[PDB]
Amino acid sequence: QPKIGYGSNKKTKFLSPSGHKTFLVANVKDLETLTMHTKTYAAEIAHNISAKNRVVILARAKALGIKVTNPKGRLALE
Amino acid sequence: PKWYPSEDVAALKKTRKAARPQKLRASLVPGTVLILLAGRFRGKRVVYLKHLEDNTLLISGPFKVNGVPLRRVNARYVIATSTKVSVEGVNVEKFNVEYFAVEDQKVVDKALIAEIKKTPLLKQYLSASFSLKNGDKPHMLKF
Amino acid sequence: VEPVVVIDGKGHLVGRLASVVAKQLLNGQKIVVVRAEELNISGEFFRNKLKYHDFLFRAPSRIFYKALRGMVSHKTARGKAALERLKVFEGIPPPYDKKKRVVVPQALRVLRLKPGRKYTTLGKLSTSVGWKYEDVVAKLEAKRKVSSAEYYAKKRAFTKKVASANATAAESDVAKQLAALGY
Amino acid sequence: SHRLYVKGKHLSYQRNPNVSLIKIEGVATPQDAQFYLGKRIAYVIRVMWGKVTRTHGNSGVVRATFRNNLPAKTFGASVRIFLYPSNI
């Protein structure tokens, strides 16, 4: 039964098993807000982005060195 | 200083844990026969010679008696029997931990055999292996 | 202590024997029950009769199997495995007729049930409820008892031979010297 | 023979899948079981390792903790208990 005692530790809260907090990204400008916080944060491309924009976002993310949580999504399946 | 520190380096707090020499179990004494419970020579009876600084007991078969050479053994993986041999005959100073990183074994074995001869049947004991037969309960068994 | 334990059914109570055997099976021990027709139950004949009826397999072995299955959680994997480990028989079929059979003291009727208290024999119950094989098993049991008497005579001769051999070993030195020295 | 251990049975869980109850042969009393505390347990091909923690009841059953819990289908399965780490 859910209750507060089950609450997770703050230092480990909102953390993926890769250790990166997921941050939603829509465009290149929003990607660039995560320029140095590559260790703390990983980008996640939004569901409504078109395929043409996703390749640009992936290229810029690779250039910045920011981990993308969902690459090869809508460019590959699963 | 060719790279400025990205993020930051969290220095570890100073540790108040000083290593100290081990306090061995009372039964282990130089010249005490031992039973090895693991490794290549598991279940084989050996002699105890000296305790090394790195907490690895030093043991000889002798290789002459049972074919077990000079070797380092962990103390916890060993049983100590109540029968003893006098180790005064063998000097056992030279070889050390760093040395481990035939003739010496022969020198040790001659002296140790010299003491082994006095006690009856000890050579046969060291030659043969040890194992648990059915109906043997270790907790009663006096080793 | 043995790969397989053969338990005689005679003079035992169904509940206690079944509980002990079920406990052993759950621990992995393989047990086989024989001569279950002469198993015993406390109470009177009518009460056990109507109990087996309000359940209503007619054979005594099947009744014992039900009583034991009541212990084990048969619907689970573990319970099923315990059940294949078990074996039950009326009379001694081969090859267990050539093997000695232990007794469980905890379930013995002589040690458990007080003299002057009514009990019931499972064979009579099974026959009364419609098990039409109590007759054939009895003759096999009589033949088994004749064979067992012959085996007992052979065992008496073997014990005499063992006594002679023990005497022979006595007049040997090495054992005597060993015993005095140690062990 | 080359056996330097006693093969014991795994009875059940503590009732907790983490803790397991082990029945060791020739051990009738807790005092006898006190010897086996701290010894390495090995269920055997694949092997899972563990250790004996503390006694359990007056029958000589002991508690045991493995690195990964037993699959619960091994109740009554044969399990090995070695002599190392020896305290004698």
Add this chain to the structure above:
Amino acid sequence: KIELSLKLVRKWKKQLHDSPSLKLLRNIISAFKVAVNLNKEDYKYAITDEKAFHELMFMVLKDVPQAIQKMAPYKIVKGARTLPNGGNVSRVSSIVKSHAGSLLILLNDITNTETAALVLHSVNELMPYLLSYRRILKELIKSIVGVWSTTRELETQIASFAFLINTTKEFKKSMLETTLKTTYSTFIKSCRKTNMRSMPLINFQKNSAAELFGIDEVLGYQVGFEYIRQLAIHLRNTMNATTKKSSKINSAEAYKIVYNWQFCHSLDFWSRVLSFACQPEKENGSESPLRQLIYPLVQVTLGVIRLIPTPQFFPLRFYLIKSLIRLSQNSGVFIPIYPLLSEILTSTAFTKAPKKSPNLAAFDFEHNIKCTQAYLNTKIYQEGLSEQFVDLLGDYFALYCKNIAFPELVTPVIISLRRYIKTSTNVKLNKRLSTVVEKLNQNSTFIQEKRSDVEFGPTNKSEVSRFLNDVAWNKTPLGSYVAVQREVKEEKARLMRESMEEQDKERETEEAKL
């Protein structure tokens, strides 16, 4: 920590071209490792000048292989580049083992053609050391296949595949059992979402991976036969799952599992592979093992086509139908496909009049697999479905356009078609079906007049295969018709591409002013 200076790189290159030593190679490779790991992670070297970094990248990829070769010159043996036995080779081998995954990171981070070519060439001159490893040779062939799979530039894909051929044909032992696996696994999982943009690229991927299977006659048979069997497993899982009552996984809509582009991509690639290996010239009067896989492939494809006779998936049937037609064209195997087509001619789209007519865009039958539920029961969709169907009949019966058996291959079809034509209500369909009927009868008459002069019976296979070898296939009434129709189709597709290409050009103009 040493700092990269334009002096230090210059000195390392200075002594590279004359009398290098293993110390220099480890130093260069460690600097290279830092260079490639700057964004993705102790390191002895620090990089601060773009000139020094670019010079390091240049000299590494273009000359560290040269020095490596000069120290440990390989020797060509039976066409394969093999290192010799010696201590110095082993020391250099560990050095290339310390360069390989920097090359791997570069491979995974390819973004354009020339960088791909440079990395692939430097990797090319380092095969003979990395063939000794399998964490590297696998990831190498896995990465370049990744590049060959994900690049949107046809030149980059050409470079990757040319590398795969050049390296594979040299050695054939360690790689070939992994190249095929990686490529066809690309066609399973890491398949490119289909669109009018990706069609030439995926067609190149298929037409390319087809060649690799054909190189090794036996080993290809070992590989494809396994993977095609994987498809069959899915095929058998969905048939049973739909048919049975079990509520395990999606009894009603299990088609999603098997009616996917990736699966159709599979069955098309296999037809292309067998067609390539079974061509008459490559056959050369010699049986090839891949021909024996024709029967499994045909059984799988036919089992997929019939699993749903619903209008929503008629485009799926058409594509596999074209694949089977290709397979029969190349191998000469007799595939029955008319029973399927005539079996669809009883549907509600081929038979009943259109209900709606919203005047949407024409459906892209070539480059789609599904109707999308808006084109169902529409004038456009019926008119395009029939447009494809008629041309498919034309192709299939154009295969045997010049064979002596064509009359009796035509009779049961003309009778059934006239039965459907006389009973079908849709006027446009009857007009199209009619045309094929009279042209079929016409070619039947043509073959009859040409066969009346024949003295050899049906048993003489040699002469039967010689019938009208002088006459071109397109000169027959069904060829001369359908060939023209093919042009009237081909041009259309061209004008689509030569249109869509411009759209992007126009789109580009906009970002110029943004």
Add this chain to the structure above:
RNA sequence: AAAUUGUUGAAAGGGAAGGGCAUUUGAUCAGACAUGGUGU
């Protein structure tokens, strides 16, 4: 249009289809240290 009924086709199964449990045999997929440096 649902809901409902009927013919035809495919599959499984048994008098119902049917599940859960155990064993058996297989098939198929993922599975880093690209370990920082030195030495001949």
Add this chain to the structure above:
RNA sequence: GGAAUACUGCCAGCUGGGACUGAGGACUGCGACGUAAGUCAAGGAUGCUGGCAUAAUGGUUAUAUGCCGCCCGUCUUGAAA
């Protein structure tokens, strides 16, 4: 007369075997000892040894074999029943 033992109670008396926890992240404090310098068990674990991968293994899926259950609601124990 001489005491011993038993019991109760105290010890800032020694020594052995177990089990769980290793939380904290530059230093600061109370201390202890050190001739002294420094060291430590003193405001939360450090050291030594060995191995460290096509593995350790993990997932999915399919048959055959047998065991149990087997109309539905409620009810029930902890759970089928």
Add this chain to the structure above:
RNA sequence: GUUCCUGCCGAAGUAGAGUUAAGGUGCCGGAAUACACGCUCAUCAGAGGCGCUCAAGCGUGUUACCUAUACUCUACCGUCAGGGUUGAUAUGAUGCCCUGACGAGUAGGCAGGCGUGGAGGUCAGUGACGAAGCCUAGACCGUAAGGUCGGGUCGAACGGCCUCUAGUGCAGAUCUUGGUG
């Protein structure tokens, strides 16, 4: 009738270790089928299931043993309280940090989150290289209401965010209608 999730205050919590009350130690089930007394087997014997009768039935004592929302220690999550911190913090002084206490709670009362629309402002937001809607025994996140992504479906526009304004899922009855016996 019930009243999205979580928390809090109050008449008359999560995980590891140990201890323990009430209880229990034939098996399912973890614990002695241990001991020592007095009894009772009655055609009303006598107690979850199977079972039990020199008891596995009673009363009377002894230990040992099993273990819970109970007690102790530690770590963690919440509420509360007391604090530190600016000639500025290496992250919103509504921030960060330190220390401690509590977490059952019926009646009653209060707060914080999730979701649904309306409007204003805003993201030089998103979109045929596929917007919104719906499904998804898939992955990640959150204690949870749920959120994000992937896939499927869908095929033309809509969403995120600050504010004010409306506004969270079920139960059951009288029966009614159509349809089927």
